[PDB]
Amino acid sequence: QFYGLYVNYRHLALLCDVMTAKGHLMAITRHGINRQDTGALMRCSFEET
DNA sequence: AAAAAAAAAAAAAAAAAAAAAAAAAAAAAAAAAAAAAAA
């Protein structure tokens, strides 16, 4: 809202629920995505293959 | 005319900034165990 851009609430609440799903702060880095419980090929496709 | 030493050609060889997590070392209070004084 500083730049006057409007994004719908669902697309923001989905991200806010993705980060707070595990009970702590799951950042969107290589330290939060690669520390999840997903598959090996999914995690190696992003960073630190 | 046959045998040996030095020079030159051919072939193999080795020489940038940011940010987060983990490891480490000095410190520091706490707690359990051992030695000494007194009743």
Q: Which nucleotide, over all strands, has the C1' atom closest to the CA of A31?
A: B20
Distance (Å) of CA A47 to CA A2, A27, A29, A36, A39: 32, 14, 9, 13, 13
- Structure tokens belonging to residue A45: 């496709």
Experimental method: cryo-EM
* Resolution, angstroms, 1 dp: 3.4
Task: Answer for the pair A37, A21: CB distance below 8 angstroms, yes or no.
Answer: no
Look up residue A36 and give its amino acid.
Answer: Q
Distance A43 CA to B1 C1' (A): 86
Running DSSP on this structure, what letter comes out for residue A3?
S
- Structure tokens belonging to residue A31: 């330290």
Running DSSP on this structure, what letter comes out for residue A46?
T
Distance A41 CA to B12 C1' (A): 46
Handedness of CA A22, A26, A31, A34 (dihedral sign): positive
